[PDB]
């Protein structure tokens, strides 16, 4: 297998983007679950479509949003490419590569996600402060191929992935909305999906300790980290993944669109002001 | 990746088929493990090698069995594909999307398998009441790729696949069979082979809660499932896996097969009784 | 998917080796860090590079040498494939088929690797009782595909795969070179890389049951079973793999190639005082 890609090939996107807008963004977003609509708490928002992109995997909703959120220069991704639609992963990843040659040096990561560890509650948002890979162990890892030095190393280390300081700072910025629900903290797994787990695979991600369970994400940070983004990220728990054969409910898309639009609110701002937390350059 | 199939292959195996027999099965059958015989207790039996039906996956001694088992319509197969004979995962759950076609709407899958339980011995049934899908973890999911809402969602649930109406109606049988070893119930894991499991590796699936590990099965139910059919399935143990350092034992296909042929009879029976628990159509 | 070879090519590669050297090894080795100084225990020594040798995957500084250790025909690896490269595993253990088809019936292979074990410390030496092959799990093993009978059989057992008998005769030969540390043994878990494990996939290594982490070995050690070989082999443990979110220490590359340079002397020696328990052939 390879990588589709050529170092160029990111250096092409990166420099035509850079040519179609003034913006030069500090900050990536990815969105997942009704932060669709933090597009309006940009300002001087420059919208383009992946499909006039070029290089950009091709989807259908997708497009990039460059801008201001909060006194900083931002990018976000509004759609997104899982691993689940086909996608291999030098795909899914293709555009945070294109973000660090945009200069970008900040990831921020966000995702609907079943609730596995029994505290959490629909609603809850959980920050990740680690993953498990599970198909990162049997090869699909986003970085499988010849390494580029230009990006990073060829075995990069992924301990400390979750900015420390990012995490932190995003516990103060809780305080200081007053909020009824306590902000979780946790391991983030990533499975491949589209379809949801079985009861007796939910007795497994618990019991290696994962504590939410989504189908993104993961490969970004990968990639992220290799570049030397700094990242942080978090989830929604839109659903509590079902772990007994006696309930007769079961996880299901309306569920997480749902969730999703009940804290668009409270996302879009906690997101907005987490901003002023990221340091500036230079 | 995509599947090499569309949506109008699928149905042109159908109506090839729909022309080609007066049969309108009802219940799909996919044997594994000597219920090779189930062939002779099926009657006005018409048989279709896997070689002259359209789009059919290339193997060698596969065939389409259809006819009567316990007055009801089916359909058999004989000889199934694996993931470790290097198929694609679309290629080998096509069949089961032709039978939903076809009009079946139950299915029934059997399969051989180790016994992780220590409470389980060679010859035992296990009835399936859940899976653990470790290649679905990975990536390695029949459903992955761009979804066909005519078959089903894009995220499916899987926490209730295998039918507990049936379940129950398939103990109710085992009594009224008069049997010596009890029917057991469980987790069955998926792994992909075709090589058996070490001992450490033996511990990990008992360590998940999986009861008996197989190479099968597990992605024709998701695909039976996101289509809205009927599951039921089951597994003859046909070796212990062995599980300490110390045992100078080893898994072999001759074990299998041997245990095979010796539940032949009770299998054979034990399902064409289970035809008169599917509830007709209408 | 299948394999790029057919029988024949594995041949073709045998007899051309076997024509540009008189050296008929009973020994494959398979170096991982710093036994690269291997080759000048050997005496005779010839050596290719794998850019000569028909067939062979294409990497760089990658040889084979053939030549006496300490009065056995072996064939050293200098320079291995991994499939995080983005090879697939059919190419990864090309050669241990070429080696068979050479008249070699034993393989040792070698690895670095991270401790998961709390006991192990850098600098220690594990052998190889067991291991768990997560890739293998999902699919990635390289016997995926039709089976050839002419190397062995479709279902294959691992569960003895690493000699009892070299394990015990490995032992000996470590008390007769007076070392402080003690030699250790254990399960040897592949994962795919290229990045190093999260601190929460550290944990789920543990929790498996495994002594140490690698990204190699097991896909050889699968193919060498399969054909007959007897296989040892074992871990120099690099580092001790990072399990608390205390620790600001980070798993890297300096570290691997630091340890394996400072066991060059002890391993070279511990190797080659080896070959003595190796029976010859007839
Ligand atoms: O309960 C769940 N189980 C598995 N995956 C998900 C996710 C997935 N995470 C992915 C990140 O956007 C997304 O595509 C979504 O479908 C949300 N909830 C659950
Ligand atoms: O002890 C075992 N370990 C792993 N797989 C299997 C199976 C597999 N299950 C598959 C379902 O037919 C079949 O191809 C068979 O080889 C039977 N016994 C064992
Ligand atoms: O701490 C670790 N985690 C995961 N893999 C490795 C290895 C890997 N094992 C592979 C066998 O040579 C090699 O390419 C190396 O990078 C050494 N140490 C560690």
Redesign the interface.
Known sequence: ??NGYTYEDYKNTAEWLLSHTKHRPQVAIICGSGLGGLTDKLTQAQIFDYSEIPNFPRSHAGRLVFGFLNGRACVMMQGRFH????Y?LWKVTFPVRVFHLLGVDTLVVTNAAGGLNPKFEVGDIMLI?????????????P?????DERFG?????????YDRTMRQRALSTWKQMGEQRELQEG?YVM???????????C??LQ????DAVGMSTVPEV?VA??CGLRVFGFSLITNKV?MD?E?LE????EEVLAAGKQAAQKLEQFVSILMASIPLPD
Chains 1, 2, 3 share one sequence.
């Open positions: 297998m390879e691993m689940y639609e086909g291999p402060r680690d993953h498990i890979n599970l198909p990162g162990f049997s090869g699909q890892n970085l499988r191929g010849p390494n190393d060829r075995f990069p280390a992924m301990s400390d992935a391991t499975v491949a999906g589209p379809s949801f787990e079985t009861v007796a695979e007795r497994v019991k290696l300790g994962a990968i980290r290799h079902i054969y309930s079961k996880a299901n898309f």
